[PDB]
Amino acid sequence: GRRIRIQRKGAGGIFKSHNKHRKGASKLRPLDYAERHGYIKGLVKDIIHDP
Amino acid sequence: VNVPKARRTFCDGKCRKHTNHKVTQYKKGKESKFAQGRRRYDRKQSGFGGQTKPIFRKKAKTTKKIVLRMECTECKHKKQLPIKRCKHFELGGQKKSRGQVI
Amino acid sequence: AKSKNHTNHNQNKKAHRNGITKPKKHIFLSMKGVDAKFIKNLRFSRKNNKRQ
Amino acid sequence: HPHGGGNHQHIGHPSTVRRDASAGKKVGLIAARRTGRIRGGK
RNA sequence: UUUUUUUUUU
RNA sequence: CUCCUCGAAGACAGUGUCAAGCGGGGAGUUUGACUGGGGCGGUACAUCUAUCAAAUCGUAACGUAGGUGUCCUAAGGCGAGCUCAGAGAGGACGGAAACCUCUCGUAGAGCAAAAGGGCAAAAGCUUGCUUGAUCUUGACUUUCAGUACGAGUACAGACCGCGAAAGCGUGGCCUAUCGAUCCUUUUAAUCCUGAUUGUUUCAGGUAAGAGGUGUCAGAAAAGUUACCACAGGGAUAACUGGCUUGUGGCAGCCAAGCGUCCAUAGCGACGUUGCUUUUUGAUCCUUCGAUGUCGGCUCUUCCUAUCAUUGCGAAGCAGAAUUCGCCAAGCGUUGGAUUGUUCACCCACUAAUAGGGAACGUGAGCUGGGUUUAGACCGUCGUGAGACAGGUUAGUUUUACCCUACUG
RNA sequence: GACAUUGUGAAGAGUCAGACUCU
RNA sequence: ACUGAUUUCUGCCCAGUGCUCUGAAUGUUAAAUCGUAGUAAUUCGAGUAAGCGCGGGUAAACGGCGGGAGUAACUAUGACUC
RNA sequence: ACCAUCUAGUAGCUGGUUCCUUCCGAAGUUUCCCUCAGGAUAGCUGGAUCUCAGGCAGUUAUAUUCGGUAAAGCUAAUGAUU
RNA sequence: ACGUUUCCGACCCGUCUUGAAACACGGAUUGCGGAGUGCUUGUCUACUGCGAGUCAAAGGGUGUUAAAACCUUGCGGCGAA
RNA sequence: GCCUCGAUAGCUCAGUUGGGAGAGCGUACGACUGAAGAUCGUAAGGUCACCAGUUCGAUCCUGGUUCGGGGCACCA
Numbered sequence A: 001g002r003r004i005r006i007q008r009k010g011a012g013g014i015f016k017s018h019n020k021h022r023k024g025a026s027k028l029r030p031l032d033y034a035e036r037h038g039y040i041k042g043l044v045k046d047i048i049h050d051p
Numbered sequence B: 001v002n003v004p005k006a007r008r009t010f011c012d013g014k015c016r017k018h019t020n021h022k023v024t025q026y027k028k029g030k031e032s033k034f035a036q037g038r039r040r041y042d043r044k045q046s047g048f049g050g051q052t053k054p055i056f057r058k059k060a061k062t063t064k065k066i067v068l069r070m071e072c073t074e075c076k077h078k079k080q081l082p083i084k085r086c087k088h089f090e091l092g093g094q095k096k097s098r099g100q101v102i
Numbered sequence C: 001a002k003s004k005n006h007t008n009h010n011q012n013k014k015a016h017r018n019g020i021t022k023p024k025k026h027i028f029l030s031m032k033g034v035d036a037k038f039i040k041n042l043r044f045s046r047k048n049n050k051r052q
Numbered sequence D: 001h002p003h004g005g006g007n008h009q010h011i012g013h014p015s016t017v018r019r020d021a022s023a024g025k026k027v028g029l030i031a032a033r034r035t036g037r038i039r040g041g042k
Numbered sequence E: 001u002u003u004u005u006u007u008u009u010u
Numbered sequence F: 001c002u003c004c005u006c007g008a009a010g011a012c013a014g015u016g017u018c019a020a021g022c023g024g025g026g027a028g029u030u031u032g033a034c035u036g037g038g039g040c041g042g043u044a045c046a047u048c049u050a051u052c053a054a055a056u057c058g059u060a061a062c063g064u065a066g067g068u069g070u071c072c073u074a075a076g077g078c079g080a081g082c083u084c085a086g087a088g089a090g091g092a093c094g095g096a097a098a099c100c101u102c103u104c105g106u107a108g109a110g111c112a113a114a115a116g117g118g119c120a121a122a123a124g125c126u127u128g129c130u131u132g133a134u135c136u137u138g139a140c141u142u143u144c145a146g147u148a149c150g151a152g153u154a155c156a157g158a159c160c161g162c163g164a165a166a167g168c169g170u171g172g173c174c175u176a177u178c179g180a181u182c183c184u185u186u187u188a189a190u191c192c193u194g195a196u197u198g199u200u201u202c203a204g205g206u207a208a209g210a211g212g213u214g215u216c217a218g219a220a221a222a223g224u225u226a227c228c229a230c231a232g233g234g235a236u237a238a239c240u241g242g243c244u245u246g247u248g249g250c251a252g253c254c255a256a257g258c259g260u261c262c263a264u265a266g267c268g269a270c271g272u273u274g275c276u277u278u279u280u281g282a283u284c285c286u287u288c289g290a291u292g293u294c295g296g297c298u299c300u301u302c303c304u305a306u307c308a309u310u311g312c313g314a315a316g317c318a319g320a321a322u323u324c325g326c327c328a329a330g331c332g333u334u335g336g337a338u339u340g341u342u343c344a345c346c347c348a349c350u351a352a353u354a355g356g357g358a359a360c361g362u363g364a365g366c367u368g369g370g371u372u373u374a375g376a377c378c379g380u381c382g383u384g385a386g387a388c389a390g391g392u393u394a395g396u397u398u399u400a401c402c403c404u405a406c407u408g
Numbered sequence G: 001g002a003c004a005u006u007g008u009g010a011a012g013a014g015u016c017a018g019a020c021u022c023u
Numbered sequence H: 001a002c003u004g005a006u007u008u009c010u011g012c013c014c015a016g017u018g019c020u021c022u023g024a025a026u027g028u029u030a031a032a033u034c035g036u037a038g039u040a041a042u043u044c045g046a047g048u049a050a051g052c053g054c055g056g057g058u059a060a061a062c063g064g065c066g067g068g069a070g071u072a073a074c075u076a077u078g079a080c081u082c
Numbered sequence I: 001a002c003c004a005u006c007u008a009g010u011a012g013c014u015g016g017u018u019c020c021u022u023c024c025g026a027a028g029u030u031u032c033c034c035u036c037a038g039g040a041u042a043g044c045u046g047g048a049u050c051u052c053a054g055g056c057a058g059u060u061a062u063a064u065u066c067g068g069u070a071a072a073g074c075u076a077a078u079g080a081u082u
Numbered sequence J: 001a002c003g004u005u006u007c008c009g010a011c012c013c014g015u016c017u018u019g020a021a022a023c024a025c026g027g028a029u030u031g032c033g034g035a036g037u038g039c040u041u042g043u044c045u046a047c048u049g050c051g052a053g054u055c056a057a058a059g060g061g062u063g064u065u066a067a068a069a070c071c072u073u074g075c076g077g078c079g080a081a
Numbered sequence K: 001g002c003c004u005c006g007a008u009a010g011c012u013c014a015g016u017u018g019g020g021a022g023a024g025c026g027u028a029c030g031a032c033u034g035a036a037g038a039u040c041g042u043a044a045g046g047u048c049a050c051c052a053g054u055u056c057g058a059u060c061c062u063g064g065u066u067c068g069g070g071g072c073a074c075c076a
């Protein structure tokens, strides 16, 4: 027989993620001296919708 | 089929005469792994290619020709005698009686 | 498509085409298959008869 | 598809397939410990 | 432990 | 100050090689033959008996009735003695049937088995002793190509068994009861070889057996295709045509009876003689480099075994009416509901609502409702792909300007 | 699963006669 | 993966085939390893993982979900019984 | 899918297989084969000739034999049957 | 004589086939092309040379009408067990 | 039509190589009960479907006959 849709999904062609308008990856700050020996203050500049 | 355990018959060895023989059943010996045929078969089987010789799968015989191996008691010379096919075979069994109630 | 169809129609004609060959006349001279003891005695007798 | 075909739309074989099945065969309930509606807590 | 029924009128 | 950039795991994981398990995810291949088409069924595939079989032998069909893949240390060999099946007549318990006795008893019994041959101081029954069911080579018969296997025959050489002996004995009274190459395995020689010389293991050889091919002269082998393909086949099926006519339809002869009495007005059982190809079968002759395969519509012509009408004869013919029969196809034999239907059934009229042929008339005349590709649904069946004269829905109907015929 | 990559220490048990094997 | 808006429901069966969970389980298991015999090839024996086999679960997993007799004040039927 | 090559792929199957005269002239039968549209095998046939110059014959006669079919029989065995 | 007319005869060839004029297939007409071959290996047969021998290989020598012809083999093939 | 399966007390079902015919319900008898039913103790019961054969003896093993039941009966 032929390959099934599940098999075809692995080649990453028409099955790639649609990320043209994504606003970035959700990630905490990299661990560093401030976070390890105190705290650092940041300002929440925006709340936005990620496609 | 019942066959006596001892039989007086011609001895093909040194005696060249009729002598007593102890009768047993011949059993096929174990196959040696260094026989030329086994060596060739193992070498052929090893590798890629799958099975290389036929496998028999259409057994039809329900019996075997029993071979009586009879060893002379005077020189240990051994004879092999095949008998006809039989379902049941016994050596030196109880001889049949006559005119007895069941 | 039955195809057994045995018959003996033209076989006698074929056999007689070249004539039925009768056995030769020297077949009665050979001593093949004669008793071994008799043949042995005959050999001994023939070996010893004086030519003259 | 392993489920395709037939004069009736039926799977024909158990939908629960083992974990180590091949790439083209691992379809359905993979390594399912159980099946059917869950009655109770789980 | 087990323990079902009793035709109608008088 | 510290040559661990900060954490987690850590000689485990991962990696390389080998080994085992799973592995229609994938690959390659197979999925016997015969066969009154194939399939299903069966084995008529190796095989023995009687018959077919037509008085040598031989002789076929999926012809007829049966049998074979076993069984036997005796049910082989041999010596001896005896006679079987059955009948009659007698004898406590004893009876139709227990055992004993005497007569008769050509085999009417038995001989492992199927059938057929054969057998009476035996080939049968009882019993004694035995292993010739042993070793060896040739010749021959059967099948037959005069090949092989299997089976058997008559001898020859050895060693034996029984018998007093002549004699008999190589398995079974005879006709069936079975197996090549390669490989494995066993037995045999105080054997041959391993080629640098030797010894011992090991291995390989010469000879005879066993392990099996039952499709039995002997490949290692599951399905489906309606998504299908190729080479062919009218050697072979489905539609027409051809032969046959069991079946279907129609018509006769004798009369036992029905018909109030009366076999023949009208019928006619038990029997029996024919006719027809508008039924369905049997066959496989033509067609598979194709004869477009149901029904209806339309339109001709033909046949009658005559429904109606014309002319008549006979009635269980006093008349609307009705029945039988003769000469008779000139002329008619309709409108509809249901169903794709041919058939079928009903409603109504009618003089009548007769039966049939023409490639089951008629698709380059139509239609396409059914059947009969590919899509799809249900029931049953199948593990599955899929199957189902089971039901259901949708599914391309090409070409005449040629010859003839016909119309002008 | 085995072998190699695979190094450095402890505790227990078992083999031996300081070694090996395992956990 | 199956089913296929909403509404109302989704019964019984884990025997079979699957899938899955525990493993003490010497039941069965390859290579490797170890021991015995032999002068050696080699022979014999022991361990010997996963799997299989034992046990449990699971059907909105594949699927499946019966027969025969008698019986009621007319008959018929059969609530009932075997 | 398409293009080239392996590739003039194999075919027990279908089709074709090109001058004249003369002479001879068949078979569809046996056995074995996964054999039944095919092969091998014997038979039938042609050619080359060679060795010789009376023993043969799809015919009769004589002599001797084999058979269990037609007819016959069941008042003879077996099996029916008035 | 491939002209005409008379009398008799006269179905279209090839092919598979038990059976073809066939309502079996190929063939509208003409020209040209078009199909048992090459080689290796066997066997029999015919002819030629020599004959218990025969043929000689690769090679060498020679050859200028020099890819030819001519000469040449302790040994090789077949045969002689 | 073909291929299988079965036939056993009044009903439903076992049964052995072939040497017994059984299990349950039903029927009959006695007991307990005022009486019936449950309960207790006893008894009798089958065409081994029919036939022929095989052996010492067959319901059984083999063959045939009758009845019932199951599956297949496909192309076009």
Ligand SMILES: C[C@@H]1C[C@@H]([C@H](O)CC2CC(=O)NC(=O)C2)C(=O)[C@@H](C)C1
Binding pocket: B053, B054, B056, F181, F182, F183, F211, F212
């Ligand atoms: C005697 C018998 C046959 C033998 C063997 O398989 C026969 C060979 C035959 C042949 O030529 N080639 C093969 O590949 C098989 C075997 O082992 C057993 C079945 C027993």
